[PDB]
Design a protein around this ligand. Structure first.
Ligand SMILES: CCCCCCCCCCCCCCCCCC(=O)OC[C@H](COP(=O)([O-])OCC(O)COP(=O)([O-])OC[C@@H](COC(=O)CCCCCCCCCCCCCCCCC)OC(=O)CCCCCCCCCCCCCCCCC)OC(=O)CCCCCCCCCCCCCCCCC
Ligand SMILES: CCCCCCCCCCCCCCCCC[C@@H](O)O[C@H](CO[C@H](O)CCCCCCCCCCCCCCC)COP(=O)(O)OCC[N+](C)(C)C
Ligand SMILES: CCCCCCCC/C=C\CCCCCCCC(=O)OC[C@H](COP(=O)(O)OCCN)OC(=O)CCCCCCC/C=C\CCCCCCCC
Ligand SMILES: NC(=O)C1=CN([C@@H]2O[C@H](COP(=O)(O)OP(=O)(O)OC[C@H]3O[C@@H](n4cnc5c(N)ncnc54)[C@H](OP(=O)(O)O)[C@@H]3O)[C@@H](O)[C@H]2O)C=CC1
Ligand code: SF4
Ligand code: SF4
Ligand code: SF4
Ligand SMILES: [Zn+2]
Lengths: 297, 208, 96, 144, 115, 156, 176, 63, 379, 29
């Protein structure tokens, strides 16, 4: 196991966990939680950042001295990926943009970059690769985002046969784009949503890293309760004490949440999914200046 | 004794010994011992119940009037049954002199608070409670003064570890400062500096 | 006398170099590894051996009070040369 | 009088090699004083003194416009002064390294380097000791 | 014999009385503490935490120790009433950032040598 | 084309503005604050660099942590950092703020202010002379000059 | 002997009373303070033109550490570990072993410059003048890790600053 | 004025030590053995109480 | 009546106010408690000397002197005469530094803020004096428990004299700005009045005593190094208010100048540390030529010197008041107990009483006139 | 050979140092 990688300590800040993890897209909403969960337990995190060094500054106190190493990269080049994942044994893929840019479309973000990452990871000898796709990802879907996810998920599994795919279902959190999106508005009764908490997704990724038998498996990370869109927005506006993103976001948010009973979930990794009723107040206490919504099961 | 040795004062030694006699004679109910060191420091060892009475007498008597309380502290000697040693240092401006009063206690026996005699002792006593866990009865407001709010333990006790038990950092998950068990990147190096071959024969103890 | 590892890393005067499978090499990516080029063992190997016609010779390292503590070295063994414990300089009696 | 200070200002303008050098030193060092040149540095720094100024302002350095590898027309810092001129400039001695050079040693750096933090040449800490415990190597031959 | 000097009580009954009074005060305070410090926990969780803290010291059989713990708890209560603490001090009682330390022998055996 | 030229020039203008007027607040926790005040003294005169003396936390650009950070103090440090307008920079001054220093193995001391806030510049010393702190401030200014926010946004 | 700072008695004759009233009404002491500040405006400022001008220092000044070596080129340190025994802040870590020629030399020499208190005890405990605390004070850093010096960094510091370090030691060693 | 209660003294609830640093540690009470490198005996006079050695590992940075 | 919490040296202050008048004042300290006293028990005496520089960090060599005096009393040795003269000279320089800092920051908090710069120029000059002697601008660690670390360089006394013969005019300019200004008077006069009996009972010392008329000074009553030999006057106030303490501190600056002149003139020749190589280390040349000197250097820098068992309380007249140390030695090379008595602790304790029936803006003036530095208050 | 040379005040000492308060009266009734 290459002695330098043997775990040591009591699982603390200055301990060693034997995890050399390269977290692509660590500067996002999910990336900060993933990096924090990795670094609070003694693992080394390599972070590749396209953006200014100032943006990443928040991550600095997430690990002990020398445990977090920042390097620059770009998806268009393979040498940068090779030098970033050269020494890692775990590669986590969190790259993803919800919209379109003049240099990166959904095909660039969700297909080419993950495929190149998986190919380089396989070439370099990375033991484990974890990929993030969507719960609603299928080739036939009208939305480009979901359609792109399906093509990418397939091509990654082709490149890295023993990769682990995680399909979170509409993550919500303190910096999320769901509850913030509906609380900033200040069409429904047919769309049902299945949100999942951000801490649960991060712990699921960590457990999938620590779980040996989850090599080729695929997971669907879903919350405890299913909510209609209308009464969920009603609850969101009630918590904020309020009276009651171009084209792809609306078409994706009016799309109902799929159900995949065959795929293993968070409970198979040992995570009790946290109900949205506990964390809604935590997220929405800042939008201010109780009667939870009914759930369908 | 050539220039490298501290000069000795016999007159002050005699005067302090005489005043030790005087204090001993006046208060036989509480005083247990009187000592005058080689560098002319006079300390009186008393029973805990005499703290209010001994302190009041030193301050008010026409021959003592030790009106100033220079310091009040505690010493931890775990080998003793009465673990903590409470020390009072008093200054008299009238006679230009200093005195020391020593007392003993343990974990569960309180000491009478001398805020009534000296207003200076108030904060001092709080510090002792914060640092050793010595309780003072009838203290106007006894609470921690130096340690963090919610800090468990008394750091200046000899069995408290140097780095304590918990340490603070910032967690972005809960978005707040959290306290977790202490882990050190480099552990403190304990040095065995003491040598054999005793240095001062005058303090040699009987071999029992 | 700086050498080079098979992986490409420079070898310090202490002989330290990460092996091929060691992840810690990641710390040197996009950066450099701090290595002293002047190896003291090679530099002291280049010094001449002095020849003094006495059985015992004293060394203070040069400079007087700016050197090391004075030491005395016996030069009775003809098979080798006397080496200062601090400075590393070598002395010898004039054989033949 | 006032005409005297004006003539000193004009001499101060002229002693910088014209208006161009005057504006150069004004926009680079925020100071246009003229003092006697003490010495030249192999990296391009110039050293001046003026004993009529008060202590602290009686010696100064004009940094070079290009040190080892970067353009230093604006980005100047105090780590660019070599150790001998560092000792002279910080008033640890009265003797500039021109009158009495330092002792020459084969191991002394022949090329001073400034602060290299935030730069691929920055120092990365690492352990200089070898592995303490050695592991057992299993045999390559089969047992049965 | 073994005569010792009282702090506040003469026997264990008065110590129990003081413990009950302190628990009364803490139970009264939990709602105002949760509301004022803007905790994300429920008042049920805070009261359960108070119960757990009181239960930690259930095996004490010495009135001096018991009323010394009562004095300490009263100090803590006065800290919380006067808002001398912050959210971080209050939140610590819950160890929400610490990984669950396992108890079974097999799990401990795998992680390390610590018994 | 001209698209990159215009953003480069505008970024240069914004960087020059941001680094040519740095308004610090100083947590004068301990004796490093004395050398911080000596940097505001006539001899070094931080004000002449555009670095005003004792700006309010609401309009402060850089936080200078000069002194020992105790456990009793870390929540207040983080709270004051959280209230700062962005862009915000943190400068660690002296051993106590850098890594605990002479009180590193203490039960009541935070082993470095970077356990609490991200730090941009480390100024080593016990205490760093006022000139060393001035060098650190100018190094932070050069670091700001090196950053490039508009180009990164353009290429994304 | 003792003095009185505030034991003055104001004169109660008519002239003194009128002086006090005129001071109250016309603000004479306020104008006099104005004059003091005005006079202070017209004198030369004490500011120096950093970084083009430097504050005066001494040969005794303590700064960035360095490991020196003899004229031959061999390092002075002999792993006696007195600097590590005397360090008030426990910033020095040392490991040694016999070299390939039997010499007593270190294999690890680390100084945590975030623990150091720059007291100079290490350089005055060393019997061979190996560890010194040199003149450099402008070595601020952008990361915590670059302030954890190992043997290579300190040896490079010594080879970088040797000229001025040796000059300062020559200037000051007769006081030790 | 005196309780005269009879019970063994146990202050564990007042010292503030964590739970697992009381019921898991094993202390050793001993008179330290004389160093065999020296013939002095002044270090073998008192009794020392020390604890059981726990795990020490290597720091990935600086070792 | 409402409760205000003025949070973040660094001080937290909880006050009950009825209108503008201060009804109750409660300082919360411990924001700079590092645990110096417990950390000292793990260091030798030489290793524990530098903590005292950090204790009261505006008057460093005064703390060094108090610690050295305590350790010397327990060691039963005495420093050479020249070491004592150097100690007293640098103690008076340190008193000048502390008084400048205290007065000018008092004015700054009130709002004057110009003498702050005017006199921090002089403070920088005095830091240069500290640097020349020890290589460190403030934490010199120059005064050791056997004398002083190193001798003065050959040009130091001339520069000290040159500095000290112009300082009186700087004090005069400060007085012109502050002493007679009516706004300064109305900010300071009849504010924070303390009676002599309450000052004695509350444990006050230093100027806080003399501001109320009490004739006490440890440099006069219980002289320690060479203080008895030098002549100076002890300024005594009359009203016990902030203005009298201001006047006392300015006159103390002047008397410190007087003592500095005397010390400059009466410097004796000789050595600087006690000639006892089992307490004070030998010279480098002796250490590099003599066997006994090398052995003693080795043992003194690895193990340290053993101090005979005993407990002492040593006090000095530090600029902020009576600064004392209660030192307990068990016979080994590490102190068994080191309690530190700082006057700031007692003064901040008395702040609550001294700020009774005053405006909220007078708490600032009272805290300033107490001369509180929280390194010594919290330790 | 050489004799003792250390920092000492010059022969005859240093010149007097002013320390008295000096606040002159400008002067007008
Ligand atoms: C008044 C009008 C301007 C001239 C002036 O102010 O002179 C003041 C000058 C004051 O003397 P000082 O500045 O104390 O003496 C320092 C030396 O002159 C120091 O001399 P220096 O070598 O520093 O001189 C540099 C020179 C050159 O300075 C510059 O070129 C930079 C300033 C340009 C300002 C535009 O400065 C000048 O002579 C120009 C004066 C400013 C004109 C505006 O003499 C007077 O004019 C007194 C006038 C009566 C006042 C009541
Ligand atoms: C008129 C319309 C107004 C619209 C709004 C704009 C606001 C007004 C614009 C005018 C701003 C003035 C800019 C002048 C800056 C030049 C300063 C010069 O000295 O900087 C030099 C070089 O700095 C930079 O290299 C130059 C950057 C200046 C701006 C570059 C191009 C900006 C033009 C864009 C204008 C279009 C405006 C459109 C937006 C509304 C060196 O300084 P620096 O190195 O720091 O300091 C080192 C100090 N030393 C020398 C003592 C060591
Ligand atoms: C006394 C006279 C003073 C005059 C008064 C002030 C004049 C104002 C002049 C305005 C100068 C132009 C300001 C442009 C810089 C604005 C700040 C900036 O650089 O932000 C970069 C920001 C970072 O975005 P991301 O990287 O995608 O997200 C990072 C967060 N995760 O990028 C942007 O959004 C660019 C904003 C558009 C600017 C494009 C054109 C430049 C401005 C034109 C002039 C504006 C006023 C007309
Ligand atoms: N709604 C949700 O939160 C859940 C998200 N999905 C998946 O989760 C992934 C990440 O989650 P999330 O935190 O919400 O995404 P974010 O928008 O918060 O962050 C995107 C991350 O990917 C990086 N990134 C994006 N585009 C590029 C690019 N063209 N080149 C290089 N890096 C890039 C970002 O860096 P930078 O900021 O510099 O651009 C950033 O690190 C995504 O890939 C998404 O598909 C899973 C289910 C729902
Ligand atoms: S960092 Fe050093 S100088 Fe600053 S307060 Fe701490 S000990 Fe003193
Ligand atoms: S630097 Fe000097 S004191 Fe330190 S180990 Fe080396 S030889 Fe010994
Ligand atoms: S200067 Fe002092 S603290 Fe720093 S390494 Fe040397 S002995 Fe240790
Ligand atoms: Zn030699």
């Amino acid at each position: 196991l290459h002695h330098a990688l043997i775990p040591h300590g009591k699982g603390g800040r200055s301990s060693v966990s034997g995890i050399v993890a390269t977290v692509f897209g660590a500067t996002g909403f999910l990336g900060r939680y993933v990096v924090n969960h990795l670094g609070r337990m003694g693992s080394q995190v390599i972070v590749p950042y396209r953006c200014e060094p100032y943006d990443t500054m928040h991550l600095r106190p997430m690990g002990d001295l020398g445990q977090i190493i920042f390097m620059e990269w770009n998806g268009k080049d393979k040498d940068s990926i090779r030098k970033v994942v050269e020494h890692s044994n775990v590669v986590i893929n969190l790259v993803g943009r919800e919209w379109e840019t003049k240099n990166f479309d959904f095909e660039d973000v969700f297909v080419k970059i993950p495929h190149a990452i998986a190919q380089v990871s396989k070439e370099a000898g990375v033991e484990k690769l974890i990929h993030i796709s969507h719960l609603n990802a299928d080739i036939k879907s009208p939305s480009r985002y979901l359609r792109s996810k399906a093509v990418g998920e397939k091509e990654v599994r082709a490149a890295f046969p023993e990769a682990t795919i995680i399909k979170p279902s509409d993550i919500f959190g303190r910096e999320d784009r769901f509850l913030n999106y509906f609380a900033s508005m200040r069409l429904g009764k047919e769309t049902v949503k299945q949100p999942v908490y951000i801490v649960d997704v991060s712990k699921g990724i960590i457990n999938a890293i620590k779980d040996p038998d989850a090599k080729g498996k695929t997971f669907a990370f879903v919350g405890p309760n299913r909510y209609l869109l209308f009464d969920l927005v009603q609850y969101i506006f009630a918590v904020a004490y309020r009276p009651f993103t171009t084209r792809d976001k609306v078409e994706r948010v009016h799309m109902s949440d799929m159900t995949l009973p065959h795929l293993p979930g968070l409970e198979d990794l040992g995570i009790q999914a946290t109900p949205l009723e506990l964390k809604a107040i935590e997220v929405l206490r800042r939008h201010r200046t109780v009667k939870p919504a009914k759930t369908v099961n | 004794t050539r220039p490298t040795i501290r000069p000795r004062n016999d007159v002050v030694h005699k005067q302090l010994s005489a005043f030790g006699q005087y204090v001993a004679e006046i208060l036989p109910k509480y005083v247990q011992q009187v000592q005058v060191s080689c560098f002319n420091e006079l300390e009186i060892f008393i029973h805990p119940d005499g703290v209010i009475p001994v302190l009041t007498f030193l301050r008010d008597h026409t021959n003592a009037q030790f009106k100033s309380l220079a310091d009040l502290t505690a010493v931890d000697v775990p080998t003793r049954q009465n673990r903590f040693e409470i020390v009072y240092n008093l200054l008299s401006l009238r006679f230009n002199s200093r005195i020391r009063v020593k007392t003993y206690t343990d974990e569960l026996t309180p000491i009478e608070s001398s805020v009534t005699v000296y207003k200076a002792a108030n904060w001092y006593e709080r510090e002792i409670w914060d640092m050793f866990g010595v309780f003072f009865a009838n203290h106007p407001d006894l609470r921690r003064i130096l340690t963090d709010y919610g800090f468990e333990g008394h750091p200046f006790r000899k069995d408290f570890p140097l780095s304590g038990y918990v340490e603070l950092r910032y967690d972005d998950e809960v978005k707040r400062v959290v306290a977790e068990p202490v882990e050190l990147a480099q552990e403190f190096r304990k040095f065995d500096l003491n040598s054999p071959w005793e240095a001062f024969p005058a303090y040699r103890q009987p071999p029992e | 006398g700086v050498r080079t590892s098979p992986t490409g890393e420079k070898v310090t005067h202490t002989g330290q170099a990460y092996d091929d499978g060691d992840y810690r090499r990641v710390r040197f990516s996009d950066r450099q590894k701090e290595v002293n080029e002047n190896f003291a063992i090679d530099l002291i190997a280049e010094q001449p051996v002095s020849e003094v016609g006495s059985r015992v010779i004293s060394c203070d390292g040069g400079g007087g009070a700016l050197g090391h503590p004075r030491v005395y070295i016996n030069l009775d063994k003809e098979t080798k040369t006397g080496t200062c414990g601090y400075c590393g300089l070598q002395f010898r009696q004039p054989h033949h | 009088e006032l005409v005297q200070v004006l003539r000193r200002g004009l001499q101060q303008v002229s002693g910088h090699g014209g208006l161009r050098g005057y504006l150069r030193v004004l926009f680079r060092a925020n100071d246009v004083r003229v003092g006697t040149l003490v010495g030249e540095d192999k990296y391009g720094n110039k050293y001046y003194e003026d004993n009529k100024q008060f202590f602290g302002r009686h010696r100064w350095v004009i940094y070079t416009t290009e040190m080892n590898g970067r353009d230093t027309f604006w980005d100047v810092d105090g780590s660019m002064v070599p150790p001998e001129w560092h000792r002279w400039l910080h008033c640890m001695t009265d003797d500039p390294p021109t009158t009495k050079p330092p002792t020459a040693r084969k191991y002394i750096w022949t090329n001073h380097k400034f602060n290299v933090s935030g730069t691929p040449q920055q120092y990365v800490p690492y352990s200089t000791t070898r592995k303490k415990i050695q592991e057992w190597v299993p045999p390559s031959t089969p047992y049965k | 014999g073994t005569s010792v000097k009282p702090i506040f009580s003469r026997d264990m009954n008065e110590a129990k009385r003081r413990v009950r009074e302190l628990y009364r005060a803490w139970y009264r305070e939990v709602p105002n503490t949760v509301h004022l410090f803007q905790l994300d926990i429920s008042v049920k969780q805070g009261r359960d935490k108070v119960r757990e803290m009181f239960m930690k010291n259930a095996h004490v059989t010495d009135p001096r120790v018991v009323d010394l713990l009562v004095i300490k708890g009263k100090m803590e209560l006065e800290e919380t009433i006067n808002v001398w603490k912050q959210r971080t001090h209050i939140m610590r009682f819950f160890h929400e950032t610490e990984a669950p330390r396992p108890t079974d022998f097999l799990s401990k055996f795998y992680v390390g040598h610590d018994p | 084309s001209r698209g990159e030229y215009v953003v480069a020039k505008l970024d240069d203008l914004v960087n020059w503005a941001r680094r040519s007027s740095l308004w610090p607040m100083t947590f004068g926790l301990a004796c490093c604050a004395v050398e911080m005040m000596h940097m505001a003294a006539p001899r070094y005169d931080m004000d002449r660099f555009g670095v005003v003396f004792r700006a309010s936390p609401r309009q402060s650009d850089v936080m200078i942590v000069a002194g020992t950070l105790t456990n009793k103090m870390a929540p207040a440090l983080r709270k004051v950092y959280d209230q700062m307008p962005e862009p915000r920079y943190v400068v660690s001054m002296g051993s106590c703020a850098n890594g605990g220093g002479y009180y590193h193995y203490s039960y009541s001391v935070v082993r470095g202010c970077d356990r609490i806030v991200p730090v941009d510049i480390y100024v080593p010393g016990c205490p760093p002379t006022a000139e060393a702190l001035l060098y650190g401030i100018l190094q932070l200014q050069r670091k700001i000059k090196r950053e490039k926010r508009l180009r990164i946004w353009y290429r994304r | 002997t003792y003095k009185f700072v505030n034991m003055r008695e104001p004169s109660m004759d008519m002239k003194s009373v009128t002086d006090r009233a005129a001071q109250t009404l016309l603000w004479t002491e306020l104008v006099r303070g104005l004059g003091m500040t005005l006079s202070y405006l017209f004198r030369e400022p004490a500011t120096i033109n950093y970084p083009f001008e430097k504050g005066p220092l001494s040969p005794r000044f303590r700064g960035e550490h360095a490991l020196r070596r003899y004229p031959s080129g061999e390092e002075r340190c002999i792993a006696c570990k007195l600097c590590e025994a005397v360090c008030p802040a426990q910033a020095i870590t040392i490991e040694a072993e016999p070299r390939a020629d039997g010499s007593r030399r270190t294999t690890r020499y680390d100084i945590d410059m975030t623990k150091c208190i720059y007291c100079g005890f290490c350089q005055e405990a060393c019997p061979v003048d190996a560890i010194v605390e040199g003149p450099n004070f402008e070595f601020s850093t952008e990361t915590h890790e670059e302030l954890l010096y190992n043997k290579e960094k300190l040896l490079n510091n010594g080879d970088k600053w040797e000229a001025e370090i040796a000059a300062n030691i020559q200037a000051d060693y007769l006081y030790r | 004025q005196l309780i005269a209660v009879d019970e063994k003294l146990d202050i564990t609830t007042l010292t503030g030590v964590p739970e697992e640093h009381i019921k898991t540690r094993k202390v050793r009470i001993f008179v330290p053995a004389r160093n065999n490198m020296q013939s002095g005996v002044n270090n073998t006079k008192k009794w020392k109480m020390e604890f059981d050695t726990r795990e020490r590992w290597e720091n990935p940075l600086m070792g | 009546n409402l409760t205000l919490n003025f949070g973040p040296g660094v001080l937290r202050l909880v006050m009950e106010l009825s209108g503008e008048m201060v009804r109750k004042c409660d300082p919360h300290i411990g924001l700079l408690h590092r645990g110096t006293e417990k950390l000292i028990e793990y260091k030798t005496y030489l290793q524990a000397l530098p903590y005292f520089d950090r204790l009261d960090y505006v008057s460093m060599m005064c703390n060094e002197q108090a610690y050295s005096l305590a350790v010397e009393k327990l060691l039963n040795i005495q420093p050479p005469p020249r070491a004592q003269w150097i100690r007293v000279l640098f103690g008076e320089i340190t008193r000048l530094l502390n008084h400048i800092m205290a007065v000018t920051t008092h004015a700054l908090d009130i709002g004057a803020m110009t003498p702050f710069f005017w006199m921090f120029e002089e403070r920088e000059k005095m830091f240069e004096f500290y640097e020349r002697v020890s290589g460190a601008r403030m934490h010199a660690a120059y005064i050791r428990p056997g004398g002083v670390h190193q001798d003065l360089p050959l040009g130091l006394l001339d520069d000290i004299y040159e500095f000290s013969k112009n300082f009186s005019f700087r004090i005069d300019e400060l007085e012109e700005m502050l002493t007679n200004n009516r706004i300064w008077r109305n900010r300071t006069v009849d504010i924070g009045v303390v009676t002599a009996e309450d000052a004695l009972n509350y444990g006050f010392s230093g100027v806080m005593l003399r501001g109320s008329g009490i004739q006490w000074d440890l440099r006069k009553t219980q002289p320690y190094d060479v203080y008895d030999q030098v002549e100076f006057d002890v300024p005594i106030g009359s009203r016990g208010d902030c203005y009298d303490r201001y006047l006392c501190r300015v006159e103390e600056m002047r008397q410190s100048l007087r003592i500095i002149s005397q010390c400059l003139n009466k410097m004796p020749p000789g050595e600087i540390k006690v000639d006892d190589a089992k307490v004070s280390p030998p010279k480098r040349a002796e250490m590099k030529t003599s066997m006994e000197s090398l052995i003693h250097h080795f043992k003194l820098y690895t193990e340290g010197y053993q101090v005979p068992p005993g407990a002492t309380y040593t006090a000095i007249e530090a600029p902020k008041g009576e600064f004392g140390v209660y030192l307990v030695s068990d016979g080994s090379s590490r102190p068994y107990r080191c309690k530190i008595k700082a006057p700031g602790f007692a003064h901040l304790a008395g702040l609550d009483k001294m700020s009774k029936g005053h405006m909220l803006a007078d708490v600032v003036a009272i805290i300033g006139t107490q001369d509180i530095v929280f390194g010594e208050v919290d330790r | 050979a050489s004799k003792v040379k250390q920092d000492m005040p010059p022969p005859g000492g240093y010149g007097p140092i002013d320390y008295k308060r000096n606040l002159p009266r400008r002067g007008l009734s």
